[PDB]
Amino acid sequence: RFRKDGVQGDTCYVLCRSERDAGVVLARIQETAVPNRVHYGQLFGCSFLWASRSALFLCDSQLDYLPARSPFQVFTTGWEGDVSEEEFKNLAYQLRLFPKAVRKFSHPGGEDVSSFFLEFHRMRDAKLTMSRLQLLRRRWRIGANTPFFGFLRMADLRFEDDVKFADEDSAADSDLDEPIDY
RNA sequence: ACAGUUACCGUAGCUGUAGAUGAAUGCUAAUUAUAGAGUAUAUCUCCUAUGACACUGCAUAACAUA
């Protein structure tokens, strides 16, 4: 379970499963469910509608912390076919689709699935890419709930011998990179 | 801002004259080719057209490396 700024239990709860088969089965029936809220006076409390959906992932590796700090708009893609090169294989087939990525990276591990990274110049290009992928997913009949793509992010860290944490910084100006257009 | 209303004196009430030109009309002028601001101005009757051909995008997997 996560936590808010005031060390309060955040409503964001995360679960896991031993196997992979049951993963899909969890995010198909937990929609609009009202088990209970609180057990006081031997009776149930207020209602609450359940909503389960895959919208977040976690990764821990020794070759991911450094690469994910240089670019400002970094993408993540996975669920690819048999083992592939970057310059010779990933670039060439990219032309067919509409990725429009400045650079790319790899993700070893020795599994039967690859995951190549993407880079963008402006926030608008990144945003537009998201839509493209989403649309394509439907066409292919892959699955709504099936992880296909995501947005990479750097988790907040708190070091020592510091008067103020980075997350609690009020003078930060890391919002100008996201222009607003309407 | 000033004169007039029996050829005596207080009130009261009238004509001409100022500016603002956000209507209409009469006479006379189309006279080099550097001519302007605002609801772009109101009521009622008959008939015709609109309504599937409206802007943009194939980056809507295109024109695709000796």
Read off the amino acid at residue A3: R
- Breaks in chain A after residues, C-to-N cutoff 2.5 Å: none
> Does the C-beta of A139 come within 7 A of strand B?
yes
- As a rounded value in angstroms, the CA-to-C1' distance for A126 and B33 is 59
Torsion of CA A106, A84, A19, A148, to 10 degrees: 70
- Given in angstroms, what resolution was this structure solved at? 3.3
CA of A156 to C1' of B19 (A): 77
Provide, in whole angstroms, the distance separating residue A36's CA from nucleotide B24's C1'.
Answer: 84
Measuring from the CA of residue A131 to each C1' atom, give the nucleotide at the shortest distance.
B59
Residue A129 CB coordination number (10 Å): 19
Q: Which nucleotide is nearest to A132 (CA to C1')?
A: B59
- Mark the nucleotides of strand B covered by protein, meaning any atom under 7 Å from a CB: 59, 61-62, 64
- Give me the CA A8–C1' B3 separation in Å, rounded: 95
CA A108 from centre of chain: 19
Query: For A112, left (φ over 0), alpha (ψ -120 to 50), or beta?
Result: alpha
Q: Which of residues 79-108 of A touch strand B (CB under 7 A)?
A: 95-98, 100
